[PDB]
């Protein structure tokens, strides 16, 4: 066995994925366009309870049987989501495929919310949210998003406080009526038959078709937001308007990253093949990270660096980051850096898949956003076929654009926007 | 049929707690089917069942009970806890089953 | 830090079976359970007496 | 479409080779154009002494600052400009350095690889300052409590032995630790019989071997240089150790029994064991309804904020336990619900239950070859371990042959009436007597 | 209610806060077993004195 | 505690049983019977007393 | 204070210069009602710029003088009742420090209307910055001002503020007749030249409620 990766797109606008890799095991999943982008002032977090809701009841399972029955069968059952994507996939051994099914038909179209449920699990939201953010990288970037928009994006990821215990079972019921449409959601499939993976689709999957809310444009705000909070450690995030996903543009940024350099190849070890890394270790002399940031959404993307670093430090380090871009848009570029950095694009791209998981969030994000699959070779045709230019331009956009910049920790020495 | 359809109505006025303003499922004893269904109550249902039995243990210490006029009538007697109070039988029959199996 | 913990030597202490560190205690165990329980058995029979 | 019985058994054969120096060569050939190779070695903090106990871990921190062949700046970037990803780590009885990069330079990685292992510059200069940057990973590490915990109960399960101490080492030993002592360790434990080249994703047997005969030379003279050593055991002793300090957030706790080692089939029925009680953490959104009934209580009544099985072998023993963690106020119901929930494995498995296990077990299997590297680690230990590799096809034969009766007769040789070790850290005022501990551990 | 029956039911409940999971000083020596003693002495007295007083 | 009715070991004993403690508001003489039972009880004790020393 | 007081001599820790950021911080708290404060570098205390503004504060409108009443004197008010239909509250906002100072105005309403809100509390200020002042309206004032400080120091509290105050940044005693000199001694064009300091200068801008419907520094 080896071949193909059948789509269908029935009649409703529902994309089919599908592949059979005759791997011992399936990984099912409902690809979703939903997210804290869809939010309004008025139902903020809605998205994030919705995640969390996951094993509520539904009017074909409750409760219970969810959870038993797909533990029944050594399962699995999560939801992960962006601020504009919303996955739902289940993992089981191929002969629980259509058991394990059942429940995730259900917990995607068939919720109920009901009142006593949903009353007893938002208490979670808190919980939930205060483990995420035990890591400050999770805290500038929802407040890097609050800074680089004023809406859509600009919504955080994780629901606010003030709102936690305030959602109710009409905004979920709506949130999920409104985005959870055919037209919007994507049911792919590794470790299953086509024919199987779509009958499936057919016959069950009932809140039929439509597109209903659509996303407000992500404007562009460029604003400065810090937190002074004691921690030793200073984050800095300093980013410009990017590329977008499906941009012809995006392929320069994703090569300028691995240029300026994102993340180590060595464990424990210096990165000389890392421009931004290896400037800023020039400048200072204590421990510190820095590293190429590059984000690419739907209408809009964000783009620039990354840096933890000792609070008296932070000055030098974040000033050094900006002069290796500044350096770097001034054609500061070799044309075998854009040969290099290429290759670990690809090897990224490539060993990222080796995963069920990863296998079947890069097939399902293609059947969503497009509806076709992007064959590995073009792929790599559309990489390395961007010039040494390209790269310098994506620097130079950035050495440009209106600057949006989010920092948290003892902050006493970090600099303001307006003084890189 | 309609025959124990009048039966009924007797013995709902037979019982008498309607002289007292409460409704049939005001009478229920608490055990834990109905506490968990008292549980689910909608805020204002909730309310409504308290102030009605707080204002029959009142009438039970005064020795009293309410003017015909404010009895509440078999016809117009609120079911406002069956619902819930059969679901929730129903999920712990589901679960006491699936433990067995 | 923690790496700079260790046990003491109880070596003044340890019954003779589990005395040699390079020695499966468990072959001995059975007998150092027997034994300890031989006693309270017999102290069940003397008091049921 | 194919049974999970069949797409089992058109899973491609492991290959194994050995060399003449000794050295095991093996892979599982894929249809993917990444890959990842590297090699198990069996050294670890196990085989160090009073002395010299840190070495296989301050050798981890330069088997990367380059080679004799090529120096730090030349190798790393050798490594990047090629995308590929270099990683390795250490424990008590094994260590191992491996490499992910394209299929392509599958042969250049395995040049790499020889060079690392066989030619560690140990550059005096560099000595001095791993030297340092090891002191600050143990202050680090000081603050993983989970990790402190786990060391802990090493330091007394296994007291007076080898297998009590960390990997990391002591601060006088990494404080002293010579260029000499790094290299005698090197050359004394990085050898082709003590090692295997496991390489997984798009590559050829054959093609790999070669490359291997052609790097890895070190041919052996004596019958010393090809013998692999027995190391000697190390006894368990029934015990505990109490780090107090109510002025920490949550406390830890660590019970375990002694393991059968690696070689046992009982480790499968262990492993179906652990499946039953499983593992929680507030996280965890099947709550009230997970069917893990420690996990459930652990819910109902907020015995704890997260709690973990576990069967960790080693060659010639073990320990199977639990570690949870809590408030100061749950510890004890904690505790109580805990060691019953064994007691229960030892006197009244149900086939249900064993039945639910077997598959939470079996897909767990699966997921560990999810990759290229995690079927590398698979087939580097595999063979370490088991002198040979082990097909999914296989543990499955063996895990479809426990039942109830089974489970029951195999934790009760394991747990019941036994003397556990315990390790305690946090504020553990409420968990207390070793003794009342001990009686948990009989009658259901 | 609670995990184990010995700290949720109202009897066993007080039987444990006094002779089993009670706090004590890891030092006290023999001079404190009089209580016990005393207390055990005095089932003992009632015990035998009811048997004499059947007579 | 404020008062000595709540915080001393003995009186308080009391006062959770029989001053301080919560009872239904429309409790009926029926009710009455546990009281003159115990009542009851404490008189025959006394009574028995008396005679049994003679 | 002399053969008592002992901690002594010099100034130590100095303050260090007041840098001026303009930056535009936002608080979404779910609060049916939004408040707004857009300002920009006002004067610094002492200054003579100081007076200017202080008229150009109650010429704008700062606090009701009728109970429940509507505020006409007020431009600033007035100006953002015919703006929005649903309650609100406006007010010039004015704050002296020692080296350095802020200026604007303070806007509370519902949060549907803080946009039309704040805007109305804007065009305020520009048509105030261009000769949108009368000759009168600084005559007027220039009287809320001097009763209103006046008014001030009745309380046995409010005057030691006054005295110390002085006898702390200065060493003298400013005459209440010498403080009234000064405020009317403030031609009709300080005030619009105040007023465009303000339209000109970086504003800094700081808002809290639902702000689902309130603009952004950049757009005003
Ligand atoms: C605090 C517990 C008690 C103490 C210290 C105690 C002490 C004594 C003493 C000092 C005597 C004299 C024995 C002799 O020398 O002949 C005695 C006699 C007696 N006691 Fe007790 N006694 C106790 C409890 C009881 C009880 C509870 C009963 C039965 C309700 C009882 C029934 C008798 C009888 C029947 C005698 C007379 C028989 C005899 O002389 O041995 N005693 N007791
Ligand atoms: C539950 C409490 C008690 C009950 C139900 C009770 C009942 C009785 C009864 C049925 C009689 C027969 C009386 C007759 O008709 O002649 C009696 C006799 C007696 N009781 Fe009690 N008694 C109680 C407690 C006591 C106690 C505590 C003592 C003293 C320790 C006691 C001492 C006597 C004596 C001395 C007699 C014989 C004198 C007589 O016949 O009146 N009784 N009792």
């Given at each position: 066995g080896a071949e193909d990766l059948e789509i269908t797109k029935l009649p409703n606008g529902l994309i089919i994925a599908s592949l059979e890799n005759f791997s011992p095991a399936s990984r099912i999943g409902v690809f979703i366009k939903a997210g804290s982008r869809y939010e309004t002032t008025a139902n903020l977090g809605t998205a994030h309870l919705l995640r969390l809701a996951s094993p509520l009841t539904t009017k074909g399972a409750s409760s219970f049987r969810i959870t038993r029955g797909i533990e029944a069968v050594g399962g699995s059952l999560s939801v992960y989501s962006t601020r504009e994507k919303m996955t739902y996939c289940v993992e089981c051994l191929r002969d629980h495929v259509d058991t394990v099914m059942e429940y995730l038909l259900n917990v995607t179209t068939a919720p109920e919310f009901r009142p006593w449920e949903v009353t007893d699990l938002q208490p979670q939201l808190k919980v939930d949210k205060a483990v995420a953010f035990q890591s400050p990288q999770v805290g500038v970037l929802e407040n890097l998003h609050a800074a680089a928009y004023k809406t859509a994006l600009a919504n955080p990821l994780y629901c606010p406080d003030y709102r936690i215990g305030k959602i109710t079972s009409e905004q979920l019921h709506h949130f999920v009526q409104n985005n959870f449409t055919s037209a919007r959601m994507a049911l792919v499939g590794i470790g299953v038959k086509h024919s199987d993976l779509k009958q499936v689709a057919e016959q069950?999957?009932?809140?039929?078709?439509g597109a209903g809310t659509s996303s407000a444009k992500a404007t562009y705000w460029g604003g400065e937001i810090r937190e002074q909070n004691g921690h030793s450690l200073v984050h800095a995030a300093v980013v410009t308007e990017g590329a977008a996903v499906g941009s012809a543009e995006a392929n320069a940024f994703s090569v300028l990253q691995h240029v300026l350099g994102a993340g180590p190849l060595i464990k424990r070890g210096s990165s000389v093949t890392s421009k931004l890394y290896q400037g800023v270790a020039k400048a200072t002399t204590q421990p510190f990270d820095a590293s190429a940031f590059n984000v690419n959404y739907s209408d809009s993307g964000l783009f620039g660096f990354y840096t933890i670093s000792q609070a008296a430090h932070a000055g030098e380090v974040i000033r050094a980051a900006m002069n290796q871009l500044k350096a770097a848009a001034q054609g500061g570029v070799t044309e075998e850096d854009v040969t290099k950095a290429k290759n670990q694009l690809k090897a990224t791209y490539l060993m990222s898949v080796e995963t069920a998981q990863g296998l079947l969030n890069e097939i399902g994000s293609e059947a969503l956003l497009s509806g076709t699959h992007t064959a590995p070779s073009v792929v790599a045709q559309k990489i390395d076929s961007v010039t040494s230019a390209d790269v310098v331009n994506a620097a130079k956009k950035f050495v440009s654009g209106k600057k949006s910049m989010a920092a948290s920790g003892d902050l006493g020495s970090t600099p303001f926007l307006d003084e890189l | 049929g309609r025959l124990m359809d009048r039966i009924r109505k007797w013995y709902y006025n037979a019982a008498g707690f309607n002289k007292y303003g409460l409704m049939r499922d005001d009478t229920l004893y608490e055990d834990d089917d109905v506490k968990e269904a008292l549980k689910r109550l909608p805020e204002d249902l909730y309310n409504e069942r308290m102030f009605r039995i707080k204002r029959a243990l009142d009438l039970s210490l005064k020795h009293r009970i309410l003017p015909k006029e404010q009895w509440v009538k078999y016809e117009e007697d609120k079911p406002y806890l069956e619902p819930y109070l059969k679901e929730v039988i129903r999920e712990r029959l589901e679960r006491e089953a699936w433990n067995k199996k | 830090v923690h790496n700079d913990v260790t046990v003491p030597d109880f070596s003044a202490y340890r019954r003779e079976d589990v005395m040699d560190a390079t020695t499966s205690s468990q072959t001995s165990s059975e007998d150092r359970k027997g034994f300890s329980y031989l006693v309270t058995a017999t102290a069940c029979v003397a008091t049921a007496y | 479409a194919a049974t999970y019985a069949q797409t089992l058994q058109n899973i491609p054969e492991t290959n194994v080779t050995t060399l003449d120096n000794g050295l095991r060569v093996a892979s599982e050939e894929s249809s993917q154009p990444t890959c990842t190779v590297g090699v198990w070695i069996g050294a670890g903090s196990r085989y160090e002494n009073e002395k010299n106990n840190g070495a296989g871990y301050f050798v981890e921190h330069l088997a990367f600052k380059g080679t004799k062949k090529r120096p730090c700046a030349a190798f790393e970037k050798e490594v990047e400009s090629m995308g590929a990803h270099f990683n390795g780590y250490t424990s008590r009885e094994q260590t191992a350095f491996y490499i992910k990069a394209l299929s392509k330079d599958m042969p250049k990685v395995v040049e790499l690889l020889a060079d690392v292992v066989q030619n560690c510059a140990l550059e005096e200069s560099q000595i001095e300052k791993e030297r340092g940057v090891i002191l600050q990973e143990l202050k680090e590490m000081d603050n993983d409590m989970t990790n402190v915990t786990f060391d802990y109960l090493h330091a007394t399960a296994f007291q007076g032995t080898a297998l009590a101490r960390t990997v990391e080492g002591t601060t006088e030993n990494i404080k002293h630790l010579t260029r000499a002592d790094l290299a005698s360790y090197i050359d004394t434990h990085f050898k082709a019989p003590r090692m295997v080249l496991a390489a997984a994703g798009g590559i050829s047997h054959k093609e790999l071997v070669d490359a291997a005969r052609q790097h890895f030379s070190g041919v052996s003279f004596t019958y010393k240089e090809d013998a692999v050593p027995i190391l000697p055991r190390c006894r368990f002793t029934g015990s505990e150790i109490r780090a107090r300090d109510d002025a920490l957030p949550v406390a830890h706790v660590a019970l375990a029994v002694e393991g059968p080692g690696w070689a046992d089939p009982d480790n499968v029925v262990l492993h179906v064991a652990n499946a039953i009680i499983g593992r929680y953490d507030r996280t965890f959104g099947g709550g009230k309804h997970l069917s893990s009934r420690l996990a459930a209580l652990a819910v109902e009544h907020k015995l704890c904020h997260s709690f973990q099985t576990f069967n960790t072998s080693y060659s010639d023993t073990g320990l199977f336990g639990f570690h949870f963690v809590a408030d100061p106020l749950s510890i004890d119901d904690m505790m109580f619900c805990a060691q019953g929930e064994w007691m229960r494995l030892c006197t009244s498995t149900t086939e249900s239950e064993v039945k639910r296990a077997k598959n939470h077990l079996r897909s767990a299997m699966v997921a560990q070859l999810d990759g290229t590297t995690p079927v590398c680690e698979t087939i580097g230990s595999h063979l370490l371990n088991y002198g040979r590799r082990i097909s999914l096809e296989e543990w499955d034969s063996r895990i479809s042959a426990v039942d109830a009766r089974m489970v029951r007769d195999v934790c009760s040789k394991y747990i019941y009436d036994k003397c556990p070790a315990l390790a305690a850290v946090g504020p553990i005022e409420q968990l207390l007597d070793y003794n009342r501990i001990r009686s948990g551990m009989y009658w259901i | 209610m609670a995990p184990n029956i010995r700290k949720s039911h109202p009897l066993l409940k007080m039987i444990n806060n006094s002779l089993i999971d009670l706090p004590a000083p890891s030092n006290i020596s023999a001079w404190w077993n009089f209580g016990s003693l005393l207390a055990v002495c005095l089932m003992t007295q009632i015990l035998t004195g009811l048997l004499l007083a059947m007579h």
């Open positions: 069950f999957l009932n809140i039929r078709s | - | - | - | -």
